[PDB]
Amino acid sequence: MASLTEIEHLVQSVCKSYRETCQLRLEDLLRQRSNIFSREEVTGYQRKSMWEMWERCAHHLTEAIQYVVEFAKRLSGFMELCQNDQIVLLKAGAMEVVLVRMCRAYNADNRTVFFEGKYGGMELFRALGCSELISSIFDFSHSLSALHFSEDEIALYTALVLINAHRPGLQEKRKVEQLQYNLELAFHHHLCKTHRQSILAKLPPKGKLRSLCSQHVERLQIFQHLHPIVVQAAFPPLYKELFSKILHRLLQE
Ligand SMILES: O=S(=O)(c1ccc(F)cc1)C1(c2ccc(OCc3ccccc3)cc2)CCCC1
After folding, report:
1. β-pair partners for 112
2. Structural domains of the chain, ranges and CATH numbers in brackets
3. Which atom of ligand 1 lies closest to the CA of 56?
4. Which atom from ligand 1 is nearest to the alpha carbon of 128?
5. In chain numbering, where does the motif AF-2 fall?
6. Which residues have a Cβ under 8 Å from the Cβ of 154 and sit 6 or more positions away?
């Protein structure tokens, strides 16, 4: 099954789905690179409370995840899967898709990320008290930046991050394997056509994204133990569902 004509159609549909569900246009992020937080604005973030900074980050992550849910809904083959499997895939892969998407908002020249209107370095996040997690996130974006991904490569690669037939809990594992295989063919065909197969060996191991997701859950457990009422009262419901229902409602709209 699936011929060359169908594989190229799948490439274009995935790229279109990605372009339609980007939270931020790449051009918009690039044209903000000179807009960097001053030392006074950096000090201001460092003086913010730990719970205020955690709440802000959980809110920004939840917004980004909402766009990944829309990407999945437009992704060829995804809505054809059962609701159980749609939820299993999003719960395990939404954070991973955001972790890949965020390289677009990272400037490797000065090691800054676009955050709340300006670019700032790791030191902007010191109030969180999760230095190892922040260093891991910046290192991950730095490693992705070195690949010089095109928008089309990010679309195909993030579709594969989401459509992973190895996720525990899948009820129709063979249907997810077939979708994964078609997407793998589309990604590799596009790399072959554009002479970009050299990136294959340089893509991060799957254990790297798993380690970032595990570090996030572990730091959230520590924070939630110190401020349980902050999480209950001020963290987004979708964030608590995924990391501590909403997904079912977003998938039905
Ligand atoms: O702009 S961000 O808030 C940001 C936070 C930390 C960072 F180092 C760089 C950027 C955002 C992001 C939010 C939470 C993330 O992990 C989970 C997490 C980490 C730390 C505290 C709470 C939650 C990762 C990324 C970028 C993509 C979507 C929003």
Report:
1. 107
2. 1-253 (1.10.565.10)
3. 3
4. 21
5. 238-243
6. 18, 100, 101, 103, 104
Q: What's the per-residue H, E or C state across 131-200? A: HHHHHHHHHHHHHHHCCCCCHHHHHHHHHHHHCCCCCCCCCCHHHHHHHHHHHHHHHHHHHHHCCCHHHH
- Burial (CB count within 10 angstroms: exposed 0-12, middle 13-18, buried 19+), residue 4: exposed
| Among protein residues, the one whose CA lies closest to atom 25 of ligand 1 | 61
Say what the alpha-carbon torsion angle 23, 27, 29, 35 is, to the nearest 10 degrees: -150
Containing 119, the helix (H) or strand (E) segment is strand 118-120
Q: How far apart are CA 29 and CA 113, in angstroms?
A: 10
Q: Are 124 and 115 in contact (CB under 8 A)?
A: yes
100 lines ligand 1 (CB under 6 A): no
Whether residue 231 has its Cβ less than 6 Å from ligand 1: no
Instruction: Reduce the DSSP state of residue 115 to 3 states and report it.
Output: strand
Question: Which among 198, 12, 172, 23 is positioned nearest to 86, based on CA atoms?
Answer: 172
